[PDB]
């Protein structure tokens, strides 16, 4: 999971 | 407006425990989208990432660091920090805390002046 | 993951001529159909200053003069017409997935 976001998807 | 800080130790001895501290102000540590890193610049070299925390608690640390470091942060008083277990001479760097918007940006938008560390007896 | 590599390492351009520096990466830095890699200067004893963001785009404050262009595996910062103040290192990075990483850096020395 990669990208903006990616570290906080859950 | 923000004002990132770090601040430790100018000098440490070989083979004892690294711990700096970044001090946001002037805007919290858990704004959300904004996750909180750490970069290191061993001199004349490159920047190297260490890893970060996210405004909401998710930490991410550098293979390489992995298994000699902690990063926590301090919810209360707006300051997070880094502890590097049995630092070497390599660990000698220009040490940065810098803030990212994970969410709409990607990018290292501030980041405090930075301490230096020197390892040496 | 991704390795950045800049070329050159170094090299010295004079007032009102053309840098070029370049940054590839080993697998595609792209995603929501943008590219999540960005430039960044550093003065000697300053902090990184960012220039310019996913890829392309222009940070406040950044000069005319700098150009961000390219995608997936390819990039290149141009500086033109050099001047001074460029006298720097840059650094392109990634931030498309984990680990985030940077390149070696490009030092820009400049003639008079």
């Known amino acids: 999971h990669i990208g903006p976001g990616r570290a906080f998807y859950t | 407006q923000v004002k990132l800080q770090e601040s430790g130790p100018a000098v440490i001895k070989p083979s004892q425990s690294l711990s700096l501290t970044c001090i946001v102000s002037?805007?919290?540590?858990?704004?959300?989208?904004?996750?909180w890193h750490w970069i290191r610049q061993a001199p004349g070299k490159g920047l190297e990432w260490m890893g970060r925390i996210c405004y909401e608690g998710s930490i991410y640390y550098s293979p390489s660091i992995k298994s000699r470091s902690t990063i926590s942060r301090d919810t209360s008083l707006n300051k997070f920090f880094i502890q590097l277990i049995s630092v070497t001479n390599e660990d000698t760097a220009m040490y940065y805390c810098?803030?990212?918007?994970?969410?709409?940006?990607?990018?290292?938008?501030?980041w405090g002046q930075g301490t230096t560390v020197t390892v040496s007896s | 993951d991704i390795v950045m590599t800049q070329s050159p390492a170094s090299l010295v351009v004079s007032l009102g001529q053309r840098a070029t520096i370049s940054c590839r990466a080993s697998?595609?830095?792209?995603?929501?159909?943008?590219?999540?890699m960005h430039w960044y200067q550093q003065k000697p004893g300053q902090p990184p200053k960012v220039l310019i963001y996913?890829?392309?785009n222009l940070e406040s404050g950044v000069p005319a003069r700098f150009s961000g262009s390219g995608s997936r595996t390819d990039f290149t910062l141009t500086i033109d017409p050099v001047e001074a103040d460029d006298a720097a290192t840059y650094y392109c990075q990634q931030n498309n997935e984990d680990p985030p990483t940077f390149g070696a850096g490009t030092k820009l020395e400049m003639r008079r």
């Open positions: 002037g805007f919290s540590i858990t704004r959300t989208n904004y996750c």
């Open positions: 996913i890829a392309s």
């Open positions: 810098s803030r990212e918007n994970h969410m709409y940006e990607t990018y290292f938008d501030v």
């Open positions: 697998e595609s830095v792209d995603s929501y159909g943008k590219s999540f």
